[PDB]
Amino acid sequence: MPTLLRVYIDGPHGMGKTTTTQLLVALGSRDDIVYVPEPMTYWRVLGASETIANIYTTQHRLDQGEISAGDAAVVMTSAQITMGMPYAVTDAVLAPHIGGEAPPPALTLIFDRHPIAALLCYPAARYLMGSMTPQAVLAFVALIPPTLPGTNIVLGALPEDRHIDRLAKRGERLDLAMLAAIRRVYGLLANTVRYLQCGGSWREDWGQLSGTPQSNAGPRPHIGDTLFTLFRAPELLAPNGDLYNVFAWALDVLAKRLRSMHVFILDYDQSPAGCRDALLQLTSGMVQTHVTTPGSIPTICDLARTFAREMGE
Amino acid sequence: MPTLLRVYIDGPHGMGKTTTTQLLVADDIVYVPEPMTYWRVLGASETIANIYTTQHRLDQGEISAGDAAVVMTSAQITMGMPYAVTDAVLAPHIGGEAPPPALTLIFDRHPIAALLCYPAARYLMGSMTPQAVLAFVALIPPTLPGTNIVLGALPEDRHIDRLAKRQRPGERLDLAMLAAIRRVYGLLANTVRYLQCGGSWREDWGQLSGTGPRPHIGDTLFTLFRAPELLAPNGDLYNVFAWALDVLAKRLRSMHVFILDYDQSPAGCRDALLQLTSGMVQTHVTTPGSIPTICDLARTFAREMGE
Ligand SMILES: Cc1cn([C@@]23C[C@H](O)[C@@H](CO)[C@@H]2C3)c(=O)[nH]c1=O
Ligand SMILES: Cc1cn([C@@]23C[C@H](O)[C@@H](CO)[C@@H]2C3)c(=O)[nH]c1=O
Numbered sequence: 001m002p003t004l005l006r007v008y009i010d011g012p013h014g015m016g017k018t019t020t021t022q023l024l025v026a027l028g029s030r031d032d033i034v035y036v037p038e039p040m041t042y043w044r045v046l047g048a049s050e051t052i053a054n055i056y057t058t059q060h061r062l063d064q065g066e067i068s069a070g071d072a073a074v075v076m077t078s079a080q081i082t083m084g085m086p087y088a089v090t091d092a093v094l095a096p097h098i099g100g101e102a103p104p105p106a107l108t109l110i111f112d113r114h115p116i117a118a119l120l121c122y123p124a125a126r127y128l129m130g131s132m133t134p135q136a137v138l139a140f141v142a143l144i145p146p147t148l149p150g151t152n153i154v155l156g157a158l159p160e161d162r163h164i165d166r167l168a169k170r171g172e173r174l175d176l177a178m179l180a181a182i183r184r185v186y187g188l189l190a191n192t193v194r195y196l197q198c199g200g201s202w203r204e205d206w207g208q209l210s211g212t213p214q215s216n217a218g219p220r221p222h223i224g225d226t227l228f229t230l231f232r233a234p235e236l237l238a239p240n241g242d243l244y245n246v247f248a249w250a251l252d253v254l255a256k257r258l259r260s261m262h263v264f265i266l267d268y269d270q271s272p273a274g275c276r277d278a279l280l281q282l283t284s285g286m287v288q289t290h291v292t293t294p295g296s297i298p299t300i301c302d303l304a305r306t307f308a309r310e311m312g313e
Numbered sequence: 314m315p316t317l318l319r320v321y322i323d324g325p326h327g328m329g330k331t332t333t334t335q336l337l338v339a340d341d342i343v344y345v346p347e348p349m350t351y352w353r354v355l356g357a358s359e360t361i362a363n364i365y366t367t368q369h370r371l372d373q374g375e376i377s378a379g380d381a382a383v384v385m386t387s388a389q390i391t392m393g394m395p396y397a398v399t400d401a402v403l404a405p406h407i408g409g410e411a412p413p414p415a416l417t418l419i420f421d422r423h424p425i426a427a428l429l430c431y432p433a434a435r436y437l438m439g440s441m442t443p444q445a446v447l448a449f450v451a452l453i454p455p456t457l458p459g460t461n462i463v464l465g466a467l468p469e470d471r472h473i474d475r476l477a478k479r480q481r482p483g484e485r486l487d488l489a490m491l492a493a494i495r496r497v498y499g500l501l502a503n504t505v506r507y508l509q510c511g512g513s514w515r516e517d518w519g520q521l522s523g524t525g526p527r528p529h530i531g532d533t534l535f536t537l538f539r540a541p542e543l544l545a546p547n548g549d550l551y552n553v554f555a556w557a558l559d560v561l562a563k564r565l566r567s568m569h570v571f572i573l574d575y576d577q578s579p580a581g582c583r584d585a586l587l588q589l590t591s592g593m594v595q596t597h598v599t600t601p602g603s604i605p606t607i608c609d610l611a612r613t614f615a616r617e618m619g620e
Contacts, residue, residue, distance in 0.1 A: 077387040085448035142398040253401045
């Protein structure tokens with residue numbers, strides 16, 4: 001069977017991920033590498049109206065005390081469902097085609113983001129921003145789809161000062177607090193994958209939090225530097241101080257989904273061509289999979305092109 | 314490996330699903346009850362009250378369809394969390410299809426109640442967008458072997474009498490919602506048969522507009538998605554929504570549906586449910602320790618979230 005290479009470029013907005021991705025794709029044949037863009041049209045029109053504007057306006061109104069935390073949470077939660085729908089549905093139809101882990105791939109699919117961006121990362125950052133409840137973040141976590149073999153995720157690194165300078169270009173609003181929260185969440189994500197792959201057991205180390213980044217290299221991180229640290233919220237604890245079981249099971253799901261992912265870090269503090277070639281070099285050490293049927297390649301290729309045409313900006 | 318029989322008791326609220334299941338369970342059979350405590354306290358405060366109050370406010374014109382939908386959507390996430398997390402942790406223990414089972418797990422509802430049925434009913438009540446409904450559909454967990462779902466049958470008037478008796482804390486007696494949820498579950502049963510008999514929604518889609526043996530597509534859940542919000546200016550369904558329907562079809566086709574007549578006494582309902590198990594599909598578990606782990610999960614869920 002032909003082989004497939006799936007690469008999800010993710011991380012905070014504003015680093016140059018979208019450009020880097022298209023430049024990489026521009027290098028190959030329009031036949032053997034396909035780009036799956038951010039579903040901007042779904043967010044602005046198809047799924048709901050101007051969802052990005054809605055998210056930023058909602059946080060703004062909350063910050064100004066014009067609406068309550070409760071009002072903000074219902075709006076953010078619904079907005080986040082809209083944000084992740086194209087990702088979830090694409091993952092669901094792609095799933096049956098992915099075989100086991102496995103010369104160049106017959107096909108390379110480069111995605112602008114993985115489902116965890118909308119089902120975990122942005123929801124967790126909004127929780128830190130006070131516009132989402134930790135229970136809702138964990139409900140999204142419990143719904144993250146099974147991690148398919150060959151899930152390569154490239155997260156980005158960029159000094160905060162450079163990031164802030166880039167970000168400030170312009171339904172978005174310049175929110176440095178949100179920028180800090182999303183950078184922190186993705187940093188914790190990278191550490192969480194490393195923690196799990198180094199054999200870390202959150203249930204075994206939970207008590208190391210009580211007293212208040214590299215994804216594929218380095219020593220095992222402390223649990224306090226992983227995503228697990230975010231769920232020590234009073235809302236999630238029983239009178240006896242322990243986490244309610246319903247939430248503990250959601251963390252078990254988080255561990256299971258992230259532990260099998262192959263994570264890489266891309267340095268975005270360089271020119272667009274530099275980012276492209278650095279990613280290209282990284283792509284060499286990534287895991288390919290076989291596909292399940294002979295026609296899986298053309299089918300997958302058609303799905304990606306249809307997705308891009310219908311939902312890409 | 315030992316065998317497991319999973320039975321999900323589902324269908325419209327107010328038929329007596331909970332009462333009947335209880336009388337049924339009363340060591341080789343465990344009951345995962347309605348997670349009322351999660352709904353009223355752990356996940357959020359009085360979610361049921363929130364849901365019915367919101368619809369009521371919408372019906373009275375005190376809030377817009379838009380405001381209602383964001384509330385219903387967020388609330389449905391809270392409602393389905395216990396089912397979703399339970400399915401996710403149970404999944405790795407389920408093996409392939411397989412004497413009596415070593416363990417029989419009876420659940421008060423399946424994840425599709427909160428990720429498909431109630432959202433579809435609220436869409437019909439004007440309080441949820443169809444795009445949100447399809448977003449929940451896209452998140453329905455893969456259907457594992459041995460997914461036996463028991464749905465109920467009960468005449469409308471009788472159902473209304475029981476509904477009046479079975480109101481949950483914060484619930485408002487809403488006959489329009491009762492009709493909507495009864496319609497959705499009826500379409501659900503028809504949809505499973507439609508798919509099992511080879512129906513292809515893409516092939517029959519034209520029948521919704523252009524006017525073996527199986528139900529007409531117009532009598533399946535697919536008909537609900539001919540919603541204009543999901544269509545392009547030329548009337549074609551956007552691909553992103555067509556893909557969600559492809560997911561819907563894949564998830565539902567392999568479920569094994571059984572109809573329980575609730576139009577009888579609690580003891581009768583209980584016995585009928587027991588009668589239905591002979592045709593249910595059992596599976597093996599994946600590890601020697603799966604059974605004990607499953608039991609613990611079920612007991613812990615009940616103790617923590619059951620009423
Ligand atoms: C995936 C995803 C993105 N976003 C944001 C970040 C950026 O401003 C922009 C482009 O990614 C859009 C609003 C979000 O808020 N939630 C999400 O799940
Ligand atoms: C599963 C589920 C139930 N409900 C309702 C119907 C009944 O009033 C009660 C008991 O089932 C509770 C509020 C709902 O609204 N959404 C859902 O996903």
